[PDB]
């Protein structure tokens, strides 16, 4: 998957 | 509850992974009308990202199962109903966040770094709305997401160094918006790679924390570029 | 909603990791009053294990922080109150499960395998209550857990082969009860060790699927033995 | 912690 911020735990 | 207690409770809820409570706390902190600290903005963001994330992941799974369902299958409508229930929850979460942003956070922001943070957040939650919208609702949500991202992008280019983690995180999510929502992988790549390259220069000026954050973001930019270029 | 749709929705919820919904579905199935199949039993067990697990982990985190905090610290009351909220939610979940077990599942079970599965579950959820209980409440709650485990253990020894996964999982959880609740590591080790040894003695008579099932749990018994004998 | 069954996902 494409990375975004913030990240869920 | 007073601010200090709400923050203690929000951090406690975070450690326990009770993100609904954490979001309620930071929501209460915001609706008191005072500007948030960097710590407090981060607590708000982490809280609501975890609240919405479970709906987003569920929605992806359910929609995937719906696609593989035969159009004539008598079980199809149950899947659709469950998808719409998850969608309804996701909208409520996004509406809550967007209202917090337009009524308190964006309006009362004083420095450009904060205004970029909140405009980025607005782009993010309109982007989540756009992932599950169809037709005109999709067009409007894409439009509101892009407008928030673009303003944040312009401000960040004007006021902040390219190594700043908030400007870098904006570029990261904005590039994903181009890739996944506008379905333009070429512009998404250039947006990510431009932000990455321009950040390389100023790394010799960051302190410990900022260097760790910025480098973490830069690695995510490079990961997306690797994924999108293969 | 009718049983077939409830099961479909429960499996969809499981895939989406929406375990509250999954549990709600399987509670509705249980309350319909018909005996559960092994697949339906597993869905019920998986759903409520995930629902209760969230509160168990949160409680462990909060209580560890409570213990580390100075008793004169003004912050302590908030931590304690929050722990109590999580405790109330944990109790609600355990009580719902135990009500299902008493009113429907144990009451209607027509074979020893299901009765052992449900009495094990009764022991498990009384054990979760015991982990958070204090005082006299604790003594009775421990008694309730132990009595369920012991009855399940006796039935399983009489009615089931030592390699049966339900009998092995019962021995695993019962040995943890001895270790963690009764604070007797020696009896916990001997319980798990007996179950393991009596199983290896009969492994080679299973097909490879059953060999896989039993071996997995036996390794968990040995994992616990290794932890406890260090 | 000790291993018990079932497990959280
Ligand atoms: Mg819809
Ligand atoms: Mg109290
Ligand atoms: Mg208590």
Residue numbers in the entry:
A (entry chain D), D (entry chain C): 337 to 345
B (entry chain B), C (entry chain A): 1 to 230
Give the published text:
The I-BAR domain protein IRSp53 is a key player in these processes, acting as a hub that integrates signaling cues from Rho-GTPases and phosphorylation pathways to initiate cytoskeleton and membrane remodeling events. In the inactive state, the SH3 domain binds intramolecularly to the CRIB-PR domain, resulting in a compact, closed conformation. Here, we show that phosphorylation of two pairs of sites within this region triggers the binding of 14-3-3 to IRSp53, which inhibits membrane binding and the interactions of Cdc42 with the CRIB-PR domain and cytoskeletal effectors with the SH3 domain. In all the structures, the phosphate group on the phosphorylated side chain engages a cluster of basic residues in 14-3-3θ, consisting of K49, R56, and R127, and additionally forms a hydrogen bond with the hydroxyl group of Y128.
Therefore, to study the binding of 14-3-3θ to the pT340/pT360 and pT340/pS366 pairs, we determined five crystal structures, allowing for direct comparisons of the structures of singly- vs. doubly-phosphorylated complexes. All the singly-phosphorylated peptides, except Site 1 (pS325), bound 14-3-3θ with ~1:1 stoichiometry (i.e., two peptides per 14-3-3θ dimer) and relatively low affinities (Kd ranging from 5.5 to 16.5 μM). For the singly-phosphorylated peptides, the electron density is symmetric for the two pockets of 14-3-3θ, even when two-fold symmetry was not imposed during refinement. Specifically, the Site 2 and Site 3 peptides contain a proline residue at the second position after the phosphorylation site, producing a characteristic 90° bend of the polypeptide chain, which as a result exits the 14-3-3-binding groove, thus leaving a significant portion of the groove unoccupied. Although the sequences surrounding pT340 and pT360 are closely related to each other, they are distinguishable by the presence of two large side chains in the Site 1 peptide, Y337, and R344, occupied by smaller side chains in the Site 2 peptide, E357, and S365, respectively. Coincidentally, 14-3-3 binds with 3-fold higher affinity to pT340 than to pT360 or pS366, whereas its affinity for the two pairs of sites is more than 100 fold higher than for individual sites. The two pairs of 14-3-3-binding sites in pIRSp53 have one site in common, pT340, suggesting that pT360 and pS366 act as secondary sites in these pairs. The doubly-phosphorylated Sites 1,2 peptide (pS325/pT340) also bound 14-3-3θ with ~1:1 stoichiometry and micromolar affinity, suggesting that it interacts with 14-3-3θ only through Site 2 (pT340) thus ruling out Site 1 (pS325) as a potential 14-3-3θ-binding site.
